[PDB]
Amino acid sequence: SSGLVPRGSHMGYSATAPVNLTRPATVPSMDGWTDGTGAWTLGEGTRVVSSDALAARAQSLASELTKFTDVDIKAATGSATGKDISLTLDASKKAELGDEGFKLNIGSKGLEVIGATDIGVFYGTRSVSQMLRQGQLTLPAGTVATKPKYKERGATLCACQINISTDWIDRFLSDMADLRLNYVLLEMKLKPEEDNTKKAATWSYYTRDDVKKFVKKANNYGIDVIPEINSPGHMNVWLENYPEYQLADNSGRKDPNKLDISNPEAVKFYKTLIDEYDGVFTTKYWHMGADEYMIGTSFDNYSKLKTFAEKQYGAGATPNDAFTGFINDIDKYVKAKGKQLRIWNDGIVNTKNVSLNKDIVIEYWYGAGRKPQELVQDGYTLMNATQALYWSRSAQVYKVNAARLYNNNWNVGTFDGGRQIDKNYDKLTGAKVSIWPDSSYFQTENEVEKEIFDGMRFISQMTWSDSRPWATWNDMKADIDKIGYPLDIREYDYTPVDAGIYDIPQLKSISKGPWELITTPDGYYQMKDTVSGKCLALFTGSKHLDVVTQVGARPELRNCADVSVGQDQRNTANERNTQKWQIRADKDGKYTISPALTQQRLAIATGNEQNIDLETHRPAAGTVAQFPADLVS
Numbered sequence: 001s002s003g004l005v006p007r008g009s010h011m012g013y014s015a016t017a018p019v020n021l022t023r024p025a026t027v028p029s030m031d032g033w034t035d036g037t038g039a040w041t042l043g044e045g046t047r048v049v050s051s052d053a054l055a056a057r058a059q060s061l062a063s064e065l066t067k068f069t070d071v072d073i074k075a076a077t078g079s080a081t082g083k084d085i086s087l088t089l090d091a092s093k094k095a096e097l098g099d100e101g102f103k104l105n106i107g108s109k110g111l112e113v114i115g116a117t118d119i120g121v122f123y124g125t126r127s128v129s130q131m132l133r134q135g136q137l138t139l140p141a142g143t144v145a146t147k148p149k150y151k152e153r154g155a156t157l158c159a160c161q162i163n164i165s166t167d168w169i170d171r172f173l174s175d176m177a178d179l180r181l182n183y184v185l186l187e188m189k190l191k192p193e194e195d196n197t198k199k200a201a202t203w204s205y206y207t208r209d210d211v212k213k214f215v216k217k218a219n220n221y222g223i224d225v226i227p228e229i230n231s232p233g234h235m236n237v238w239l240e241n242y243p244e245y246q247l248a249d250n251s252g253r254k255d256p257n258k259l260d261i262s263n264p265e266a267v268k269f270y271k272t273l274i275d276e277y278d279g280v281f282t283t284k285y286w287h288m289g290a291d292e293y294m295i296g297t298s299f300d301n302y303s304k305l306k307t308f309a310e311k312q313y314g315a316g317a318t319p320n321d322a323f324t325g326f327i328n329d330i331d332k333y334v335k336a337k338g339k340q341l342r343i344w345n346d347g348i349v350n351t352k353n354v355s356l357n358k359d360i361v362i363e364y365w366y367g368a369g370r371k372p373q374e375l376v377q378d379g380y381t382l383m384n385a386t387q388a389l390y391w392s393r394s395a396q397v398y399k400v401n402a403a404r405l406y407n408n409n410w411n412v413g414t415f416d417g418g419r420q421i422d423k424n425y426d427k428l429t430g431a432k433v434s435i436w437p438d439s440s441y442f443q444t445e446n447e448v449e450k451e452i453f454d455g456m457r458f459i460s461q462m463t464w465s466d467s468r469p470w471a472t473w474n475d476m477k478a479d480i481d482k483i484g485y486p487l488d489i490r491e492y493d494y495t496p497v498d499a500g501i502y503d504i505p506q507l508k509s510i511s512k513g514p515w516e517l518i519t520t521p522d523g524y525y526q527m528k529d530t531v532s533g534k535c536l537a538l539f540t541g542s543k544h545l546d547v548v549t550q551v552g553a554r555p556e557l558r559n560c561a562d563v564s565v566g567q568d569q570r571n572t573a574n575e576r577n578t579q580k581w582q583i584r585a586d587k588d589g590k591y592t593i594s595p596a597l598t599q600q601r602l603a604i605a606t607g608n609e610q611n612i613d614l615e616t617h618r619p620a621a622g623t624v625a626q627f628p629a630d631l632v633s
């Protein structure tokens, strides 16, 4: 017999360690590790030790680690032993570590994490978590210092038209933090409240309270949440109920997506929205979008913009001049609020009489004029937002292929359509992936979460480390899976009730029930009415992106779809996903039921709910209908 037995190494440092004991991987990788003598073992008595100032970081890591290791790891102040993880903020190490970098020293004095800022120290702790939650509690001795090559690292998250649940955003923010991603462009609607703007309070929207909560979580994780209100195109969710601000073509037909930038009341309406967001986002940036204004058409069909150009910016001025002038005017406005402006690159056009202010950050997603190289020569600040880092729930041409980017040597300097610029260009801020809903019924938000996993590790690695220490994608994939998700995601209670048979009074107007609940692989439920044999669906009402956004829409009974299959069954996606429901536990113990796609909540209608959609149609009082949560607290 073999005698196989656990090594069961004593806690703390040991001068003795095997030469090739595995150093557990991280993402981002920490390159240039210098090996030392021996190894350090987390074990019973290991504490996380820090100053009072770092006490919250220390307590949160001790908790975390207690949960991952099954050892009781307490936080403390005072002296550290060789048994301990130490957290140190040393601001004098800015030159070495920057605002975000960190140093690990593993050895006889234990596991030391050193940062020059609170966020650096926090970031060090993400590597410590990663390293110790792979089933190994012994780490080889040595030292490494690491900092991100690029200043902006993260994602565009389009929480736009459709709602991405605040619980999803929270999980996403923890995922980002674990990967040392510090940037999220959140295109979204903050519920408008002013008399002048409140008719745009259609769903999706987020409350002021919702936003202040996820922003404060973001800032604790080192993440800049930058809002976007795209303009002057892609404005349907703002101008639908304000036709007075929509741009008409030459024949008088209005487009709810197009802002009439020759109308000063319209410009002012946009500026009013900037002012509403200013109260709840802490960032120093404003993103005005400026992408795809004329998609589906041309400036030749909007002669009003030419006339406006010429009046406004003198004879010779073109519609492109008016467009840029609108951008410059929004620039001037946000700068007076202390902000820097950001846009998409496809706005930037050939202008005769006006030129785009150079103090506007250009996020470059589309190979169409200027090319990246030309924007470099004229001195623009650039972020790489290449389409090669796009996911879309419906557009299958937009699926990040991380294997391919890894194996083909893509870097942050590889702009859209393989246009390589100097990756050390001094105004290259970094790079991001982009998460787009488009036609939204094809994939649930929890399916988006599973899918983006890999691409998020890829962009973390290349924006921080800009290296390929794994020989192939497949090696990186093996390690990123061993690393796995941060604790908050592992703890999220996706399906808080067991499958089974339930009485649900809230649903009495549809059926006396009872209801058979079964779970789905993406963390939702199907609800079968045992009376009719049919299943509850949120299927009918007015939609954006092919999803029912109508406030007060009623669910219905439909033939049961197969909710057990994956997102590659595109042909049945709508019947399937309109039959998914998210159940959540209250603080404490009461359950809400939300349609998985819409993320409104089922409630009994009172008739006192106030929303613009309800002015035009209200479900019968006392029936069960979907409503944003803020209307039913």
Ligand SMILES: CC(=O)N[C@H]1CN2CC[C@H](O)[C@@H]2[C@@H](O)[C@@H]1O[C@@H]1O[C@H](CO)[C@H](O)[C@H](O)[C@H]1O
Pocket: 158, 160, 161, 187, 230, 234, 289, 291, 292, 344, 365, 390, 392, 395, 398, 436, 437, 438
């Ligand atoms: C900046 C950008 O990429 N603009 C649109 C084009 N791309 C190409 C692939 C994606 O489908 C993406 C579109 O989703 C982008 O538009 C955004 O669409 C959302 C809804 O999906 C909102 O309407 C935004 O305002 C658009 O910018």
